[PDB]
Design an enzyme around this catalytic site. Structure first.
Site, short mmCIF file in Angstrom:
data_model
loop_
_atom_site.label_atom_id
_atom_site.label_comp_id
_atom_site.label_asym_id
_atom_site.label_seq_id
_atom_site.Cartn_x
_atom_site.Cartn_y
_atom_site.Cartn_z
N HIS A 233 109.79 113.65 59.46
CA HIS A 233 110.86 113.15 60.46
C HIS A 233 111.10 111.64 60.10
O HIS A 233 112.12 111.28 59.77
CB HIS A 233 110.51 113.34 61.70
CG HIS A 233 111.16 112.53 62.84
ND1 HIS A 233 112.16 113.24 63.63
CD2 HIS A 233 111.44 111.12 63.17
CE1 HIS A 233 112.94 112.32 64.43
NE2 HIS A 233 112.55 111.20 64.11
N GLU A 234 110.01 110.82 59.80
CA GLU A 234 110.12 109.44 59.35
C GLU A 234 110.86 109.38 58.04
O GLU A 234 111.71 108.49 58.17
CB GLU A 234 108.71 108.90 59.37
CG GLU A 234 108.12 108.72 60.88
CD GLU A 234 109.18 108.03 61.88
OE1 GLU A 234 109.84 106.99 61.50
OE2 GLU A 234 108.93 108.58 63.06
N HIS B 157 114.63 109.64 58.33
CA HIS B 157 115.07 108.26 58.51
C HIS B 157 115.30 107.64 57.28
O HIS B 157 116.48 107.00 56.94
CB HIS B 157 114.24 107.32 59.52
CG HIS B 157 114.46 107.98 61.01
ND1 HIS B 157 115.54 108.44 61.55
CD2 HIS B 157 113.24 108.13 61.85
CE1 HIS B 157 115.40 108.72 62.77
NE2 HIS B 157 114.08 108.71 63.15
N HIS C 172 119.19 110.53 64.68
CA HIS C 172 118.67 111.35 65.37
C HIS C 172 119.77 112.34 65.59
O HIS C 172 120.89 111.91 65.77
CB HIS C 172 118.19 111.13 66.80
CG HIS C 172 116.53 110.44 66.32
ND1 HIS C 172 116.30 109.37 67.33
CD2 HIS C 172 115.83 110.83 65.86
CE1 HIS C 172 115.08 108.93 67.16
NE2 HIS C 172 114.79 109.90 66.16
C1 LIG Z 1 110.55 103.32 72.36
C2 LIG Z 1 110.83 102.58 70.92
C3 LIG Z 1 112.12 103.20 70.02
C4 LIG Z 1 111.89 103.08 68.56
C5 LIG Z 1 113.34 103.39 67.82
C6 LIG Z 1 113.32 104.35 66.63
C7 LIG Z 1 112.02 105.23 66.50
C8 LIG Z 1 111.99 106.53 65.75
O1 LIG Z 1 113.22 107.26 65.85
N1 LIG Z 1 111.16 106.86 64.83
O2 LIG Z 1 111.10 107.90 64.11
C9 LIG Z 1 113.83 103.93 65.42
O3 LIG Z 1 113.20 103.37 64.72
N2 LIG Z 1 115.15 104.25 65.26
C10 LIG Z 1 116.17 104.94 66.11
C11 LIG Z 1 116.19 106.61 65.37
C12 LIG Z 1 116.80 106.11 63.86
C13 LIG Z 1 117.33 104.61 64.03
C14 LIG Z 1 117.69 104.40 65.51
C15 LIG Z 1 115.87 103.98 64.07
C16 LIG Z 1 116.15 102.11 64.04
O4 LIG Z 1 116.08 101.52 65.04
N3 LIG Z 1 116.67 101.85 62.83
C17 LIG Z 1 117.42 100.56 62.86
C18 LIG Z 1 118.41 100.70 61.59
O5 LIG Z 1 118.33 101.49 60.68
O6 LIG Z 1 119.50 99.86 61.60
C19 LIG Z 1 116.33 99.61 62.34
C20 LIG Z 1 115.18 99.89 61.83
C21 LIG Z 1 114.11 98.80 61.50
C22 LIG Z 1 114.51 97.60 61.41
C23 LIG Z 1 115.65 97.02 61.63
C24 LIG Z 1 116.67 98.21 62.00
ZN LIG Z 2 112.91 109.42 64.70
#
Ligand SMILES: CCCCC[C@H](CC(=O)NO)C(=O)N1[C@@H]2CC[C@@H](C2)[C@H]1C(=O)N[C@H](C(=O)O)c1ccccc1
Ligand SMILES: [Zn+2]
Ligand SMILES: [Zn+2]
EC number: 3.4.24.19
Length: 201
Positions: free
Chosen positions: A93-94, A97, A103
């Site tokens: 899953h990670e 990303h 998601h």
């Molecule tokens: C309760 C805390 C919520 C954590 C957020 C989520 C965690 C996740 O999904 N892990 O698998 C995440 O990291 N996310 C959300 C799902 C995909 C995107 C949105 C990601 C995120 O925040 N991405 C940002 C981006 O790509 O712009 C980002 C990540 C790291 C640093 C800066 C921005």
């Molecule tokens: Zn996620």
């Protein structure tokens, strides 16, 4: 839900990696298998980092914020793997990303496919259910994928396990489609990954 921005797509589908310290040999092997699982079905490739400027770092750290979607560029980007998010499917899953997937429940068209039960979301966590804005995402012709490794479970961020936050809107093969699987990449995950990286048929 694939990123629409070309710059977040990893060039040639090659993603270099570092496995950080403080992991067991066992945990290290699961990371390897998760990257391999991506490779078996797609043209995406994970390489040990030599001198690449952009690469991922498996970092021993509490689970949570945040997994950058796609290639950030201009340096390393961390994947937080802790006690409770180190199993194969969670790592896959990670890495979803990492290759460029948001998601699935935040697709701009998601309201045709699932209901969000707002009253059941943990207060302060509603932002996790916001739709992606339409300019940020591309479907590439792929239908809404209930089976995606990037799809939330029925009760993700719920006030309690018996309260649903996400409820599919219709039946698929006589049945309400199950959501939140963390076993393997779906047909949809592969098809959408192949499209995003223009993988040879
Ligand atoms: C309760 C805390 C919520 C954590 C957020 C989520 C965690 C996740 O999904 N892990 O698998 C995440 O990291 N996310 C959300 C799902 C995909 C995107 C949105 C990601 C995120 O925040 N991405 C940002 C981006 O790509 O712009 C980002 C990540 C790291 C640093 C800066 C921005
Ligand atoms: Zn996620
Ligand atoms: Zn999918």
């Amino acid at each position: 839900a694939a990123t629409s921005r070309p710059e977040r797509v990893w060039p040639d589908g090659v993603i270099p990696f570092v496995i950080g310290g403080n992991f067991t040999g066992s945990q290290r092997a699961v990371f390897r298998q998760a990257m391999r699982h991506w490779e078996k079905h797609t043209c995406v490739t994970f390489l040990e980092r030599t001198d690449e400027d952009s690469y991922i770092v498996f970092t021993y750290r509490p689970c949570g914020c945040c997994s950058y979607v796609g290639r950030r560029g201009g340096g390393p980007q961390a994947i937080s793997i802790g006690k409770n998010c180190d199993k194969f499917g969670i790592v896959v899953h990670e890495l979803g990303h990492v290759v460029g997937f948001w998601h699935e429940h935040t697709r701009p068209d998601r309201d045709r496919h699932v209901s969000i039960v707002r009253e059941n979301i943990q207060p302060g966590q509603e932002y996790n259910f916001l739709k992606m804005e339409p300019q940020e995402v591309e479907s590439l012709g792929e239908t809404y994928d209930f089976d995606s490794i990037m799809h939330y479970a029925r009760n993700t961020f719920s006030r309690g396990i018996f309260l649903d936050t996400i409820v599919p809107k219709y039946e698929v093969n006589g049945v309400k489609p199950p959501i939140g699987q963390r076993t393997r990449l779906s047909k949809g995950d592969i098809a959408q990954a192949r499209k995003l990286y223009k993988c040879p048929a």
